[PDB]
Design an enzyme around this catalytic site. Structure first.
Site, PDB file in Angstrom:
ATOM      1  N   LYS D  10      16.448  42.925 -29.378  1.00  0.00           N
ATOM      2  CA  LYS D  10      16.013  43.482 -30.646  1.00  0.00           C
ATOM      3  C   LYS D  10      17.224  43.865 -31.487  1.00  0.00           C
ATOM      4  O   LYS D  10      18.294  44.176 -30.960  1.00  0.00           O
ATOM      5  CB  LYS D  10      15.122  44.704 -30.418  1.00  0.00           C
ATOM      6  CG  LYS D  10      14.548  45.302 -31.688  1.00  0.00           C
ATOM      7  CD  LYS D  10      14.281  46.780 -31.528  1.00  0.00           C
ATOM      8  CE  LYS D  10      12.808  47.082 -31.669  1.00  0.00           C
ATOM      9  NZ  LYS D  10      12.419  47.300 -33.088  1.00  0.00           N
ATOM     10  N   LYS D  15      23.726  44.241 -29.248  1.00  0.00           N
ATOM     11  CA  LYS D  15      24.205  42.902 -28.860  1.00  0.00           C
ATOM     12  C   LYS D  15      25.701  42.809 -29.159  1.00  0.00           C
ATOM     13  O   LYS D  15      26.494  42.937 -28.222  1.00  0.00           O
ATOM     14  CB  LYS D  15      23.367  41.878 -29.625  1.00  0.00           C
ATOM     15  CG  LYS D  15      21.859  42.074 -29.523  1.00  0.00           C
ATOM     16  CD  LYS D  15      21.065  40.877 -29.980  1.00  0.00           C
ATOM     17  CE  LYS D  15      20.641  40.966 -31.429  1.00  0.00           C
ATOM     18  NZ  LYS D  15      20.121  42.310 -31.767  1.00  0.00           N
ATOM     19  N   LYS D  41      25.487  38.023 -41.238  1.00  0.00           N
ATOM     20  CA  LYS D  41      26.250  39.225 -41.543  1.00  0.00           C
ATOM     21  C   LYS D  41      27.720  39.078 -41.175  1.00  0.00           C
ATOM     22  O   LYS D  41      28.555  39.818 -41.707  1.00  0.00           O
ATOM     23  CB  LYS D  41      25.639  40.429 -40.826  1.00  0.00           C
ATOM     24  CG  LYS D  41      24.578  41.151 -41.641  1.00  0.00           C
ATOM     25  CD  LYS D  41      23.978  42.343 -40.902  1.00  0.00           C
ATOM     26  CE  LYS D  41      23.994  42.153 -39.394  1.00  0.00           C
ATOM     27  NZ  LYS D  41      24.049  43.453 -38.670  1.00  0.00           N
ATOM     28  N   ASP D 129      16.033  39.356 -34.752  1.00  0.00           N
ATOM     29  CA  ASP D 129      14.775  38.844 -35.290  1.00  0.00           C
ATOM     30  C   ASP D 129      14.919  37.345 -35.506  1.00  0.00           C
ATOM     31  O   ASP D 129      15.325  36.883 -36.573  1.00  0.00           O
ATOM     32  CB  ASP D 129      14.402  39.575 -36.573  1.00  0.00           C
ATOM     33  CG  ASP D 129      13.863  40.967 -36.311  1.00  0.00           C
ATOM     34  OD1 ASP D 129      12.666  41.090 -35.975  1.00  0.00           O
ATOM     35  OD2 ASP D 129      14.637  41.939 -36.439  1.00  0.00           O
TER      36      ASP D 129
HETATM   37  N1  LIG Z   1      12.161  59.627 -35.089  1.00  0.00           N
HETATM   38  C1  LIG Z   1      12.155  58.804 -34.046  1.00  0.00           C
HETATM   39  N2  LIG Z   1      12.333  59.320 -32.809  1.00  0.00           N
HETATM   40  C2  LIG Z   1      12.328  58.490 -31.761  1.00  0.00           C
HETATM   41  N3  LIG Z   1      12.164  57.171 -31.736  1.00  0.00           N
HETATM   42  C3  LIG Z   1      11.990  56.693 -32.977  1.00  0.00           C
HETATM   43  C4  LIG Z   1      11.971  57.414 -34.148  1.00  0.00           C
HETATM   44  N4  LIG Z   1      11.766  56.565 -35.227  1.00  0.00           N
HETATM   45  C5  LIG Z   1      11.664  55.369 -34.695  1.00  0.00           C
HETATM   46  N5  LIG Z   1      11.793  55.388 -33.331  1.00  0.00           N
HETATM   47  C6  LIG Z   1      11.735  54.275 -32.404  1.00  0.00           C
HETATM   48  O1  LIG Z   1      12.704  53.328 -32.782  1.00  0.00           O
HETATM   49  C7  LIG Z   1      12.267  52.007 -32.376  1.00  0.00           C
HETATM   50  C8  LIG Z   1      12.335  51.090 -33.568  1.00  0.00           C
HETATM   51  O2  LIG Z   1      11.600  51.690 -34.656  1.00  0.00           O
HETATM   52  P1  LIG Z   1      10.749  50.721 -35.593  1.00  0.00           P
HETATM   53  O3  LIG Z   1       9.805  49.936 -34.751  1.00  0.00           O
HETATM   54  O4  LIG Z   1      10.178  51.506 -36.721  1.00  0.00           O
HETATM   55  O5  LIG Z   1      11.873  49.740 -36.151  1.00  0.00           O
HETATM   56  P2  LIG Z   1      11.990  48.809 -37.441  1.00  0.00           P
HETATM   57  O6  LIG Z   1      13.328  49.025 -38.048  1.00  0.00           O
HETATM   58  O7  LIG Z   1      10.764  48.987 -38.261  1.00  0.00           O
HETATM   59  O8  LIG Z   1      11.927  47.371 -36.757  1.00  0.00           O
HETATM   60  P3  LIG Z   1      12.657  45.965 -37.019  1.00  0.00           P
HETATM   61  O9  LIG Z   1      13.875  46.271 -37.828  1.00  0.00           O
HETATM   62  O10 LIG Z   1      12.987  45.414 -35.657  1.00  0.00           O
HETATM   63  O11 LIG Z   1      11.666  45.115 -37.767  1.00  0.00           O
HETATM   64  C9  LIG Z   1      10.871  52.204 -31.768  1.00  0.00           C
HETATM   65  O12 LIG Z   1      10.936  52.313 -30.351  1.00  0.00           O
HETATM   66  C10 LIG Z   1      10.418  53.514 -32.409  1.00  0.00           C
HETATM   67  O13 LIG Z   1       9.423  54.164 -31.656  1.00  0.00           O
HETATM   68  N1  LIG Z   2      26.593  51.861 -25.009  1.00  0.00           N
HETATM   69  C1  LIG Z   2      26.799  52.330 -26.234  1.00  0.00           C
HETATM   70  N2  LIG Z   2      27.100  53.641 -26.389  1.00  0.00           N
HETATM   71  C2  LIG Z   2      27.307  54.109 -27.626  1.00  0.00           C
HETATM   72  N3  LIG Z   2      27.263  53.467 -28.788  1.00  0.00           N
HETATM   73  C3  LIG Z   2      26.964  52.175 -28.596  1.00  0.00           C
HETATM   74  C4  LIG Z   2      26.729  51.545 -27.398  1.00  0.00           C
HETATM   75  N4  LIG Z   2      26.451  50.202 -27.610  1.00  0.00           N
HETATM   76  C5  LIG Z   2      26.527  50.048 -28.911  1.00  0.00           C
HETATM   77  N5  LIG Z   2      26.833  51.213 -29.557  1.00  0.00           N
HETATM   78  C6  LIG Z   2      27.006  51.411 -30.975  1.00  0.00           C
HETATM   79  O1  LIG Z   2      25.871  50.879 -31.617  1.00  0.00           O
HETATM   80  C7  LIG Z   2      26.265  49.858 -32.564  1.00  0.00           C
HETATM   81  C8  LIG Z   2      25.922  48.502 -32.003  1.00  0.00           C
HETATM   82  O2  LIG Z   2      25.147  47.766 -32.978  1.00  0.00           O
HETATM   83  P1  LIG Z   2      25.200  46.177 -32.873  1.00  0.00           P
HETATM   84  O3  LIG Z   2      25.475  45.596 -34.214  1.00  0.00           O
HETATM   85  O4  LIG Z   2      26.080  45.786 -31.735  1.00  0.00           O
HETATM   86  O5  LIG Z   2      23.687  45.843 -32.509  1.00  0.00           O
HETATM   87  P2  LIG Z   2      22.922  44.450 -32.591  1.00  0.00           P
HETATM   88  O6  LIG Z   2      21.928  44.404 -31.486  1.00  0.00           O
HETATM   89  O7  LIG Z   2      23.923  43.367 -32.740  1.00  0.00           O
HETATM   90  O8  LIG Z   2      22.137  44.583 -33.975  1.00  0.00           O
HETATM   91  P3  LIG Z   2      21.640  43.471 -35.028  1.00  0.00           P
HETATM   92  O9  LIG Z   2      20.905  42.427 -34.239  1.00  0.00           O
HETATM   93  O10 LIG Z   2      20.746  44.203 -35.992  1.00  0.00           O
HETATM   94  O11 LIG Z   2      22.881  42.929 -35.683  1.00  0.00           O
HETATM   95  C9  LIG Z   2      27.742  50.130 -32.849  1.00  0.00           C
HETATM   96  O12 LIG Z   2      27.879  51.080 -33.897  1.00  0.00           O
HETATM   97  C10 LIG Z   2      28.234  50.675 -31.505  1.00  0.00           C
HETATM   98  O13 LIG Z   2      29.339  51.543 -31.634  1.00  0.00           O
HETATM   99 MG   LIG Z   3      24.868  42.011 -34.460  1.00  0.00          MG
END
Ligand SMILES: Nc1ncnc2c1ncn2[C@@H]1O[C@H](COP(=O)(O)OP(=O)(O)OP(=O)(O)O)[C@@H](O)[C@H]1O
Ligand SMILES: Nc1ncnc2c1ncn2[C@@H]1O[C@H](COP(=O)(O)OP(=O)(O)OP(=O)(O)O)[C@@H](O)[C@H]1O
Ligand SMILES: [Mg+2]
Ligand code: ICS
Ligand code: CLF
Ligand code: SF4
Ligand SMILES: [Fe+3]
Ligand SMILES: [Mg+2]
Lengths: 271, 522, 476, 271
Positions: D10, D15, D41, D129
């Protein structure tokens, strides 16, 4: 007099959860609201409808042959407080075209008039990774007029919100869609609110609200309910109601000013 | 009014007085048409060089192009194999257009199918579409092979042809051993010739990639010939005839001769002739592969050299005199068989014809266009004839082809006034023929309008068109012609000389005015 | 016999797989003119089965190639890759009068020539630049229409914003049409989209203008596309009746005629299939009545002329009677010359939305019997119309496949087949005379009394040509 | 010996962060590795390269006319430890079609000869996604052979994993693509490890590792520097080494089978 708002942001920042709780709070005080989920995986209406699988526009259109033969009644579904829920639908990941799915769903909702002269709010819950014009469907002309970006005090959300503003600026110049505010969902790392306020000031917008990371919402999401449907005396319910009030009382709509990555360097070297 | 004795079609039935008055009344009443003088001065402006400068500054607008999209070439390549069905994964409108185009050119039935993907297929993919389409096609039209290309609709959404076909085989829609080669043919990349190249590479890969463990180069004493995008049956005929006169064993891959030349004997034949699958599986065993049109057979060359391990010769298209000689000599070197006296005598006849016609051919100026290899062959042949190419246009050409043609022009003295244009359409050529008038034009039917344009400026500014290339729509049975080899050079020479003589006869038919030069003997 | 036709249908469908056979069984019917509801006998307007060699087109053909293309003063841009505009260039004989390249642009191909960078990054800026180049290079154009192709619809380009912005900036009418081929199932949705585009962007511009003088005899032909001059041949008859025609939709039609249409008193619709939507919209918004008419053959033309004259005063009825009296001997001579050579011969038709039923009366006027007709993309209403024109126990096929049509022709064995270029040579190789019924085999016009003679001459020249007696070699 | 792996999950799980630190650990061990970023991106290789982005394939292809005239060394650059980095790039959000860009970049890499450098690992960083087949290009035939999904103890993370598996099964029966493991990122939520291993052993997969939420990672990306480079002496920067060791040693390649959420719901009654 029907207001149209789009909910954008980075993936997993809490667009759908916050949007559904916000519309539940709006229905609590009593304005009719519609939700349109432009996410192919169809999770934008799970909490309101208390259902996992519904009839999206595309699967129903596939059953009915063509989108021209689709009926609004077969896809329009009411929920809590009279909120109307429709799902664009789309393919399973790895095949087809989600963006064309959003395009066709919104075109159908506009030709078969779904915005009846009773709605006070219409929200468009958009997919996190907008990679084509289809996911920019909600923010074109005669469509969503306000945009709210969901962010957090992490480099992820800051960079994603900056890129999303870069994407919006072209529609803002071409049309009349504006940034109405920034919602931050706390990850509880450090000095979140100050960083969000700083980025909003740099772009030229305001921090709509601070919604803290409360586990209660997770519990609510266990049983396909919003926090409002849970014990309303919880603090997060009051936070969502305050967010709904502030959204109703919003005046500031600006054309966002994207910043260069160096500005993000300066902001990062500030806390 | 119509007289039953002499019925008039649109021309000249719309030239009678009453129709003229009706048209004039409609024009003066309801069109709000621009005044005639405005139209004449705008046309005159379009013929100038300021308009040429504005026209050549175009960056986003393409007016009257001279190319098509890849799946057309993919269909043409698929039609060259025995009992093979061109299947196009995408929209049915594309297949309808391809069929109409090839029907109007060849005046022959053209068989091609589609899965007819719709909006729901766009959103969800075309997996079920291809399963159903393959089953239906095999059941109804009974082909021995289905060659699958793509439309732009499927190429944008990333339809995985390989996975879809493998899933269709796994679920039982088609037998596992049924050959279904595929190629990705995006219409927003390249042109129809690129689609031909991609389809041939896909078929060759399907038949040879996984079975190259027992293949020895030169085991079957044959030479593979890859013709490329060819729309003259006479070219296939002349290539096969010349190879058989030399006694050279050959395998002409993608031979669409028969399916485009079926007889009218009371029955309809969907499939006729074609390259056989046994010829394709045995292709790596050949001595060497010769590409007749190397400038669009690039991916095919890469695959042949990297997998079949054939040292493909660097030969131009066998067109004109010198390149035909080079082709024959290279084939003789590869196969070890001498060139027979028949081909020497044919070359002598061609040289005799050039000697006879050099007086009327020398110094004439031509504006030509078409496909890269065919255009460069025409340029070479015209240079050998003493003619002067002045406007060379290739809409689907690249920089390297430009450099090659520039080198060819620089070799000859008859290329000092020659410019080569790549990426330009026929509106650019219209401006060029108005601002730098050539004696003639050489191209497809789309050039006729340009000729019309010139005739509107004046009889002395008219640039007649000579119809060589693809597609030819307003003339019958010109696809029968030959352009390759000595026979093709003879046909082209005859066409050019007779066109010049016909133009001269038209110019000298005025009694008491220009009939002093109306000579019986020319 | 009805049983024979049913058995032929079943034998033909036996070769299909289960789902395809089930689908195709609903698109083949045996005629019964007593039935007024064809949905009880045939099913139309459905997606074609994959891989069955359909002869249908796409919505792009229905919009750019059919409706918008004939409008001569406009410039039509095939937004997208190069193939579509090239295949659709000058392939339809929608005749027009004008100076091509200056004030008329029907036969010219404007395209954006999409590359991969235009797909990955978009084509809105390229579209704006293209509009600027079109304006600077063709100053005498009266408008631009941007016809979308499949990638434009897929990647979500906002051509409406570009159209609006450049129309405001350049004071020109730019009409964006979303005629992507994957939309719909055939050209019919292209017709619908084109009519909606005309309604939204062109029709209501002289809505508060009273400059035009409106005679009480104002008519507009809607749905005649001047294929070989048909619209002109109908217009000569219309004016001879005393009626003033302001607009022709859309063959040899200008922008001004379209904008002046809402001022007319009658809408004479020839092709109901392609223009019924705009006819209904004009009736609802402006109150202009619309009526259908047929100008194929003398009987249908006379009936249509009397029907149109019945909606005006007595002077127009008298002029109509004069017109029939004047044109009587010509078509009587045509019949006398050609009916003996065409009496009793049987014709099988497969054309698109309208002509399978409109040209029947012309065939009966020559002693011709239509043993089977069918449509490419017509809806059920067209079938309700055609069941009462076809004889008893006659085949009706909707969206026929190559195999189905081949077997039907082999069993029925008609003397003549009228269809498109995609089946002409197939049946010409079977020793069956063929007439192109989309392009009049590069002949025409066939509308009106002047066109009836050409129609009879062409049918004679093809059906009685000696070449059909030489297909079998004497030694075989 | 050239193993091809793709990281799915997700959006927002981590990732890019996890892939980059894992690649850095692998390079520290002594394995040459090439990262291919299929996200418009253009941030999948920012920590290895110590810069935002140098030259994406689609930007360079557009600037040079067509990808046919482009050269390999121009778009691809080496970072720490010889990590050979290329990125597809794409348009700004809301315009164009990024999936076609990914398709073209991968075709370009194949035809030019990128996977012929005696590489040991090739890691595909794809966005969460997956909205089209263009983003499923990394899992086509002859492409990435092992898929690792990164998901924490979240409802939608575990639902996004199931949807990704639903997308995978289409490609798993027509090729050799198999789901190599399940990497678990953290959210510091109660009893995360046991629930994650319950998913792992109820999915037929194996839980490879569990990386804790340490603030050093967010403290290292500000300096665009990998955690290995920031401080190879903390509790972290060895968790990634353990993950790398268990990635080189993983031999469980099992086709996934989607589970039912109701039964999945039972796991919440466990934790
Ligand atoms: N205030 C919160 N406290 C704890 N968990 C939260 C909170 N808000 C969102 N989450 C959790 O974060 C996760 C992602 O939230 P959400 O499904 O709204 O993402 P999204 O950005 O709408 O999804 P996407 O970008 O993948 O389409 C879910 O597990 C949701 O329950
Ligand atoms: N184990 C971890 N502990 C603390 N921070 C973490 C950890 N893993 C990732 N992060 C933080 O969370 C972010 C990682 O987001 P990242 O872009 O890698 O996610 P992603 O799955 O690639 O998202 P997207 O698919 O939307 O691009 C960074 O800001 C990183 O510092
Ligand atoms: Mg990424
Ligand atoms: S518009 Fe239609 S297929 Fe009504 S798309 Fe087609 S020039 Fe046909 S039967 Mo070509 S509904 Fe016209 C037609 Fe009829 S192009 Fe012409 S002949 S009367
Ligand atoms: S159903 Fe119709 S004709 Fe087909 S594409 Fe689509 S709008 Fe056009 Fe176009 S360039 Fe070639 S012919 Fe196609 S593959 Fe694309
Ligand atoms: S990037 Fe968007 S428009 Fe392109 S194929 Fe994917 S979903 Fe469709
Ligand atoms: Fe023929
Ligand atoms: Mg969401």
């Amino acid at each position: 007099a029907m207001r149209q708002c789009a909910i954008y942001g980075k993936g997993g920042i809490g667009k759908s959860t916050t949007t559904q709780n916000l519309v539940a709070a709006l229905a609590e005080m009593g304005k009719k609201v519609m939700i349109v989920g432009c996410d192919p995986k169809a999770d934008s209406t799970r909490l309101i409808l208390h259902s996992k699988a519904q009839n999206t526009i595309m699967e129903m259109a596939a059953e009915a042959g063509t989108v021209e033969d689709l009926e609004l009644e077969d896809v329009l579904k009411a929920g809590y407080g009279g909120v109307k829920c429709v799902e664009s639908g789309g393919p399973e990941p790895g095949v087809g075209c989600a963006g064309r799915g959003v395009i066709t769903a919104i075109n159908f909702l506009e030709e078969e008039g779904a915005y009846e002269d009773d709605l006070d709010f219409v929200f468009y819950d958009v997919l996190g990774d907008v990679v084509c014009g289809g996911f920019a469907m909600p923010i074109r002309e005669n469509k969503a007029q306000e945009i709210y970006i969901v962010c957090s005090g992490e480099m992820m959300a800051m960079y994603a919100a900056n890129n999303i503003s870069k994407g919006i600026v072209k529609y803002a110049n071409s049309g009349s869609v504006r940034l109405g505010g920034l919602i931050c969902n706390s990850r509880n790392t450090d000095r979140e609110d100050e960083l969000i306020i700083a980025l909003a000031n740099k772009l030229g917008t305001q921090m709509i609200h601070f919604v803290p990371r409360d586990n209660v919402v997770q519990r609510a999401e266990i049983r396909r309910m919003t926090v409002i449907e849970y014990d309303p005396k919880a603090k997060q319910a009051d936070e969502y109601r305050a967010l709904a009030r502030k959204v109703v009382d919003n005046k500031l709509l600006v054309i966002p000013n994207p910043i260069t990555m160096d500005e993000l360097e300066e902001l990062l070297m500030e806390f | 009014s119509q007289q039953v004795d002499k019925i008039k079609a649109s021309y000249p039935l719309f030239l009678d007085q009453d129709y003229k008055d009706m048209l004039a009344k409609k024009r003066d009443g309801f069109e709000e048409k621009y005044p005639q003088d405005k139209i004449d001065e705008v046309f005159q402006w379009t013929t100038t060089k300021e308009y040429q400068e504005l026209n050549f500054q175009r960056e986003a607008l393409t007016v009257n192009p001279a190319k098509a999209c890849q799946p057309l070439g993919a269909v043409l390549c698929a039609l060259g194999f025995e009992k093979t069905m061109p299947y196009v994964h995408g929209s049915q409108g594309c297949v309808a257009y391809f069929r109409s185009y090839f029907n109007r050119h060849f005046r022959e039935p053209v068989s091609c199918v589609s899965d007819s993907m719709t909006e729901d297929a766009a959103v969800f993919g075309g997996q079920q579409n291809m399963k159903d389409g393959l089953q239906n096609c095999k059941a109804t039209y009974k082909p021995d092979m289905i060659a699958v290309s793509t439309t732009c609709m499927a190429e944008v959404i990333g339809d995985d042809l390989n996975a879809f076909i493998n899933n269709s085989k796994k679920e039982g829609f088609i037998p596992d051993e049924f050959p279904v080669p595929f190629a990705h043919t995006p219409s927003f990349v390249g042109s129809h010739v690129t689609g031909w190249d991609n389809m041939f590479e896909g078929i060759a890969r399907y038949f040879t990639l996984k079975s190259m463990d027992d293949k020895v180069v030169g085991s079957n004493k044959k030479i593979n010939i890859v013709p490329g995008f060819e729309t003259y049956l006479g070219n296939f005929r002349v290539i096969k005839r010349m190879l058989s006169e030399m006694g050279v064993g050959y395998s002409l891959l993608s031979d669409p001769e028969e399916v485009l030349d079926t007889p009218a004997d009371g029955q309809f034949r969907m499939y006729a002739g074609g390259t056989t699958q046994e010829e394709m599986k045995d292709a790596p065993n050949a001595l060497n592969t010769v590409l007749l049109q190397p400038w669009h057979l690039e991916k095919t060359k890469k695959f042949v050299e990297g997998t079949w391990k054939h040292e493909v010769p660097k030969l131009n298209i066998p067109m004109g005199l010198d390149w035909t000689d080079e082709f024959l000599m290279k084939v003789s070197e590869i196969s070890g068989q001498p060139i027979p006296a028949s081909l020497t005598k044919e070359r002598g006849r061609l040289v005799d014809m050039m000697t006879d016609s050099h007086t009327w051919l020398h110094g004439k100026r031509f504006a030509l266009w078409g496909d890269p290899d065919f255009v460069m062959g025409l340029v070479k042949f015209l240079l050998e004839l003493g003619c002067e190419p002045v406007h060379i246009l290739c809409h689907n050409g690249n920089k390297r082809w430009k450099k090659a043609v520039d080198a060819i022009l620089a070799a000859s003295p008859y290329g000092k006034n020659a410019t080569v244009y790549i990426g330009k359409d026929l509106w650019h050529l219209r401006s060029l023929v108005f601002t730098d008038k050539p004696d003639f034009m050489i191209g497809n039917s789309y050039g006729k309008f340009i000729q019309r344009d010139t005739l509107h400026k004046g009889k002395e500014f008219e640039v007649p068109l000579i119809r060589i290339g693809f597609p030819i729509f307003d003339r019958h049975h010109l696809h029968r012609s030959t352009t390759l080899g000595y026979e093709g050079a003879m046909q082209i020479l005859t066409t050019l000389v007779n066109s010049i003589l016909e133009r001269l006869d038209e110019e000298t038919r005025g009694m008491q005015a220009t009939d002093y030069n109306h000579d019986l003997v020319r | 016999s009805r049983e024979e036709v049913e058995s032929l249908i079943q034998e033909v469908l036996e070769v299909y797989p289960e789902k395809a056979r089930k689908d195709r069984n609903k698109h083949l019917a045996v005629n019964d003119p007593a039935v007024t509801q064809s949905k009880k006998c045939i099913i139309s307007n459905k997606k074609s089965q994959p891989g069955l060699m359909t002869i249908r087109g796409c919505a792009y053909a229905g919009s750019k190639g059919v409706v918008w293309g004939p409008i001569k003063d406009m410039i039509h841009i095939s937004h997208g890759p190069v193939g579509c505009g090239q295949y659709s260039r000058a392939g339809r004989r929608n005749y027009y009068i004008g100076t091509t390249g200056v004030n008329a642009f029907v036969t010219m191909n404007f395209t954006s020539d999409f590359q991969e960078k235009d797909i990955v990054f978009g084509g809105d800026k390229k579209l704006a630049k293209l509009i600027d180049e079109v304006e600077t290079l063709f100053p005498l154009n009266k408008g631009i229409s941007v016809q979308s192709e499949c990638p434009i619809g897929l990647i979500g380009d906002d051509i409406e914003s570009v159209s609006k912005v450049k129309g405001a900036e350049l004071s020109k009418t730019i009409v964006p049409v979303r005629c992507e081929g994957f939309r719909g199932v055939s050209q019919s949705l292209g017709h619908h989209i084109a009519n909606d585009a005309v309604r939204d962007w062109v029709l209501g511009k002289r809505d508060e203008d009273t400059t035009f003088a409106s005679t009480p005899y104002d008519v507009a032909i809607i749905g005649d596309y001047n294929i070989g001059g048909d619209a002109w041949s109908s217009r000569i008859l219309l004016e001879e009746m005393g009626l003033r025609c302001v607009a022709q939709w859309s063959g040899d039609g200008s922008i001004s005629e379209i904008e002046l249409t809402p001022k007319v008193k009658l809408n004479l619709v020839h092709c109901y299939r392609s223009m019924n939507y705009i006819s209904r919209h004009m009736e609802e918004k402006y109150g202009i009545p619309w009526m259908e008419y047929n100008f194929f053959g003398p009987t249908k033309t006379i009936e249509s002329l009397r029907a149109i004259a019945a909606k005006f005063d007595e002077s127009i009825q008298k002029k109509c009677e004069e017109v029939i009296a004047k044109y009587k001997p010509e078509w009587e001579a045509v019949v006398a010359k050609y009916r003996p050579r065409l009496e009793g011969k049987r014709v099988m038709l497969y054309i698109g939305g309208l002509r399978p039923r409109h040209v029947i009366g012309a065939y009966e006027d020559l002693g011709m019997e239509v043993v089977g007709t069918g449509y490419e993309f017509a809806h059920n209403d067209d079938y309700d119309r055609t069941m009462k024109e076809m004889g008893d126990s006659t085949l009706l096929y909707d969206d026929v496949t190559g195999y189905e049509f081949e077997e039907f022709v082999k069993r029925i064995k008609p003397d003549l087949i009228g269809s498109g270029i995609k089946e002409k040579f197939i049946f010409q190789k079977m020793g069956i005379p063929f007439r192109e019924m989309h392009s009049w085999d590069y002949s025409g016009p066939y509308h009106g009394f002047d066109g009836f003679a050409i129609f009879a001459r062409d049918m004679d020249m093809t059906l009685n040509n000696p070449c059909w007696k030489k297909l079998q070699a004497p030694w075989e």
